[PDB]
Each structure stands twice: as structure tokens, then as C-alpha cells.
Ligand binder design. Structure first.
Ligand SMILES: Cc1cc(-c2nc(C(=O)Nc3cn(C4CCOCC4)nc3C(N)=O)co2)ccn1
Length: 286
């Protein structure tokens, strides 16, 4: 489709069963939730869509900024915005429906989905890196790269999502997700090098199948396994997701080497996204 649609609030309310907050499994419409708002499944113009209901003038400005960023950022590895609603009670954004949900939910097999093969994980890592490359080429810093923000379409093509914190340098309002954040981002710096660090945590989640933070785990933060492997207390083999049957040591170690480079403590020692893209291609190169 070739245009952004203005939707009525009542149409979005109607097609989401009055913004039914129950999960889809029990008969509801909720698909995702966070600080941004709630994402609901809807049906508009004989098509399934995702509706983000934003959770006053400052919120209207972030809504306008989100529309602006999505209108400029159209790429096969970015979620596509279809339309918006601002006439009624709440502000809504309508996106292309991602039938295979988030990479976080697919890694945890949420709702009974089969585990992702190593082959599919390599394709998703490459796709996500292609999306970040587009953002950085167009001078955008995502600021919240994480597996919950990597969505998957009908063909498991990776789509970077949630550009609510994106910026086109220091800040006094530090935003992002702690378990994925680079040390300089936690201190207030705004740099695309921080997105690279966060992508390195995503690569560890892909290799291990483990969440970035788990209170009932040692270590609690996934990024800390890099030190265990460097100090030879553990190997990458010990951490490889046992829910795969097709992982091979060579390609897993090649992905771990990229993740390790991304997780360098000094921002200038990290590879840029073009180099990450090159290394991920060499991993599967024939
Ligand atoms: C925060 C955000 C989200 C979006 C967006 N989300 C979708 C979408 O379709 N999301 C999902 C769909 N399913 C399942 C599909 C299978 O059945 C259960 C829900 N999970 C999700 C999910 N975990 O977000 C499309 O755009 C855009 C901008 N900011």
C-alpha cells in the first residue's frame, strides 16, 4: 500500500475488541506492553494490524516525532507504520502485523512455538544488523536495541521496532533498557556506538537462548558471561542453547567473536555496523 491512513479512534477501539488487555491465547487482543503503551491485535480493511495505544502536550509531541521518524525510515528490516489516530480519547499508531512476534518471545518459545534453528538465528542476526545499518547510515540512533524490539514477519524476516526513543552529545534524561546498555549510555552519552553494544547482548541471547537479565540466575546479567569465558571459568559451548540440533562450533564461535567485539568496554574499540554486517556475512559465507 502506498499511503499513511488517518484512522478514527472508534474504528481502532472496535477492531481491537475495545482494546482487550487479555493475551490473545485466552481470547484477548494484547500482544505486547511496556512504558510506550500497549500493542493490540486489530483487523482493518480486511487485514490484520498491530495498534499501539500510547500511554499531554509532551505525549502529543512524542507521537508526532514517531510519525516523522517512521515516515523517513522505510526499509525491509524496519517495522512499517501504516497509519495513526488522534481524533479520540487516546493517541494510536497502526503498524504492519508481525505474525511471528518478537525475537525474545521466539527465543523463549512463548505460547508453544518450536525453538528457532541455528540457521534461522543466523538469518535473523544478519537481518537485524541490516536494519541497524540503515538507521546509522541515515544518522539515527535507536537507543533501545533489544530482542523484544526485533520483530518477525511471515517469513521470519527481522524488523527493528519501537523508535519511541530514536534520535536524529550528552543528555540529562537517560533512557534505554539497563541489561542491554553500554557503560557510556548509562552515563548520558548519545552515540550510535551504544547501539552496537546493545546488539552484542542480542547476539548472546541468540547463541544462548537466555534472557539478558534473570534474577534467578548466576550471573544475573547475560553480558557477564563474556568475562567468565575470557577468564576460562566457562566456554561458549557450555552456554549454547540446548534447544537447537543444528548449531556447529565454527559458526557459533564466529557469532560469539562478533558479540565479544560489540561488547568492548571502550566505545571506540567496537566495530561499526558495516563491519558487524561484514563479519555476520563471513560467518555463513560460501
Ligand atoms: C512496541 C512497538 C511494536 C510495534 C509492532 N508490533 C507489531 C506486532 O505485530 N507485534 C507482535 C505480534 N505478536 C504476536 C503474533 C503471534 O500471536 C501473538 C502476538 N507479538 C508481537 C509483539 N511481541 O510485539 C507490529 O508493530 C511497532 C512499534 N512499536
Amino acid at each position: 500500500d502506498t499511503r499513511f491512513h488517518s484512522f478514527s479512534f472508534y474504528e481502532l477501539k472496535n477492531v481491537t475488541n475495545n482494546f482487550d488487555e487479555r493475551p490473545i491465547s485466552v481470547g484477548g487482543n494484547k500482544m505486547g506492553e511496556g512504558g510506550f503503551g500497549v500493542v493490540y491485535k486489530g483487523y482493518v480493511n480486511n487485514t490484520t494490524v498491530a495498534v499501539k495505544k500510547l500511554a499531554t502536550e509532551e505525549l502529543k509531541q512524542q507521537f508526532d516525532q514517531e510519525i516523522k521518524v517512521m515516515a523517513k525510515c522505510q526499509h525491509e528490516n524496519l517495522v512499517e507504520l501504516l497509519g495513526f489516530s488522534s481524533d479520540g480519547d487516546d493517541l494510536c499508531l497502526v503498524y504492519v502485523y508481525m505474525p511471528n512476534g518478537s525475537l525474545l518471545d521466539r527465543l523463549s518459545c512463548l505460547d508453544g512455538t518450536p525453538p528457532l534453528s541455528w540457521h534461522m538465528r543466523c538469518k535473523i542476526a544478519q537481518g537485524a544488523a541490516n536494519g541497524i545499518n540503515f538507521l546509522h547510515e541515515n544518522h539515527h540512533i535507536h537507543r533501545d536495541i533489544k530482542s523484544a524490539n526485533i520483530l518477525l514477519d511471515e517469513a521470519f524476516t527481522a524488523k527493528i521496532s519501537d523508535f519511541g526513543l530514536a534520535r536524529a552529545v550528552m543528555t540529562s534524561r537517560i533512557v534505554g533498557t539497563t541489561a542491554y546498555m553500554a557503560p557510556e549510555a548509562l552515563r548520558g552519552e548519545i552515540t550510535p556506538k551504544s547501539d552496537i553494544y546493545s546488539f552484542g547482548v542480542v547476539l548472546l541471547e541468540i547463541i544462548t537462548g537466555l534472557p539478558a537479565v534473570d534474577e534467578h540466575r548466576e550471573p544475573q546479567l547475560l553480558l557477564d558471561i563474556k568475562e567468565e569465558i575470557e577468564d576460562e571459568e566457562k566456554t561458549i559451548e557450555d552456554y549454547i542453547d540446548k534447544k537447537m540440533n543444528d548449531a556447529d562450533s565454527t559458526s557459533v564461535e564466529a557469532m560469539y567473536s562478533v558479540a565479544s567485539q560489540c561488547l568492548h568496554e571502550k566505545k571506540n574499540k567496537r566495530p561499526d555496523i558495516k563491519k558487524v554486517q561484514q563479519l555476520l556475512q563471513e560467518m555463513t559465507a560460501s
